[PDB]
C-alpha cells in the first residue's frame, strides 16, 4: 500500500513535532495511520526504519535539488550563488525541522542513520571542494588550505549551525540571521588572503 | 571518600575509551574502582551523575585555561593569538577525547548535561564576541557581521570541528590539521572585508 506506507511516514513527521522518537509508540504511529500494529510491522520493522526512511527522504530532497542547481546556477556574483546553494540547505532542511532534529539525535544510537548522514556529507563536501579546486583554478581564489579540509569544516559549520538554529538552541544563530552568517564566513574563507 | 570519588571517575573515563556509556553498567564502575554497588550509589546516583561530572570537570578545566590566557595573552600577532586560544580548547578536549565523545551523545538524553554545555558555550561566545567588538573599536576588524553572530557560528564550527576530527568521523579534518583550518576560518571571517 504506497499509501498505507505514506500515511505511516506522514504520521510520524507530524508526531515528531510534538515529541522524540522515544516518546511515540508503534501504537501511535499505526492509530494515526488507520492501521493496526501488525500492519504497521508488514511496511516497517521498527520505528528507528521510519525514522531512517523520513530522513533519507529529507537528505535525497536536498541532495537533488543541490544536483539542480549545479546544473543551472544563478546569474550573479560569487557571493549570491554560494548563498543560493547554502540556501537549498537551509530551505530543505528548514522545512523538515523535525524529521532534521530526530535524524540528528538518532546519529550516536542507530548505524544506519549515522551512515546516511555521513553518505551525504561526503558527497556534499567533495562537491564543495572541487568548487572551491575550480575558483582556484580560475584565479577568483588563492591557494590558502587544502580544499577539501576547508571544504569538510564549513560543512560542519552549516550543520551544526543550521541545526542549533532550527532548534532554537541556546547558543544558535536566530534563524532569520543564519543564511547571512554563513554565507559571510563562506565567502570570507574561501577567498581571503 | 575523595579517593573513593575519584577512583569512580577514574574508572568511568578509562572505560568510556572503549565503550559507550550504555555499555558500562553501574557494576562495571564499583568493580573498577575497589567498591561495592551500594557505597558507588552513595557517591553518585547513577553512571549518568557520573558523566556529567566527568563533563564539568573538562569543560572547568578547559574554561579556567581561556581565563589564564586572557589574562596573559601572547606577544604575538592576531593570528597566532587566536591560534593560542583556539588551541586551548583543541588540547583540552583532546586530552578527553572519551568524556567529550559521550558528554555529546548524552546532550541528546540529558537535561543536566545539556545545561552544563549551554552555559559554558554561551559563556565562550560572549568572550570571543566582546574580542571582535574590541577588535573593532581599534579598528583592526572591520564592522560586519554581528559580532555576537559571528561569534556564534565560529564556536559552533569549532565544537562540531573539533569532536568530529577527536572521534575519526567520517567526514572528518584530520586532527593534524585541525587547527590550521579553524583559524583561518576565523581569521578571515572576523577581518575579511
Ligand atoms: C558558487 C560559485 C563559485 C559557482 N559559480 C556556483 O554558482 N555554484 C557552485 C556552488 C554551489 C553551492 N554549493 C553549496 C553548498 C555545498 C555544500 C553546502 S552548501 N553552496 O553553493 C552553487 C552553484
Ligand atoms: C586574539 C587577539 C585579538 C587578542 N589580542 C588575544 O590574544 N586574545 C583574545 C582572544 C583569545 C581567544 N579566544 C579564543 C576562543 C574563544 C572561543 C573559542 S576559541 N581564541 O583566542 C586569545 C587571547
Redesign the interface.
Known sequence: GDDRELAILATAENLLEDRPLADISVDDLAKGAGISRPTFYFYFPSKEAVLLTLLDRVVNQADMALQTLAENPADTDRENMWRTGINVFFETFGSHKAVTRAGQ?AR?TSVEVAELW?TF??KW?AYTAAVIDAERDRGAAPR???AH??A??????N???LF?SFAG??????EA??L???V??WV??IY?E
Chains 1, 2 share one sequence.
Open positions: 539525535a550516536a555521513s556529507m561526503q563536501i590558502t588550505l587544502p579540509e576547508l569538510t569544516a564549513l560543512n560542519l559549520m550543520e551544526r549551525t542549533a538552541e541556546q547558543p544558535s544563530v536566530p540571521r543564519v547571512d552568517t554563513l559571510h564566513i570570507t574563507s581571503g
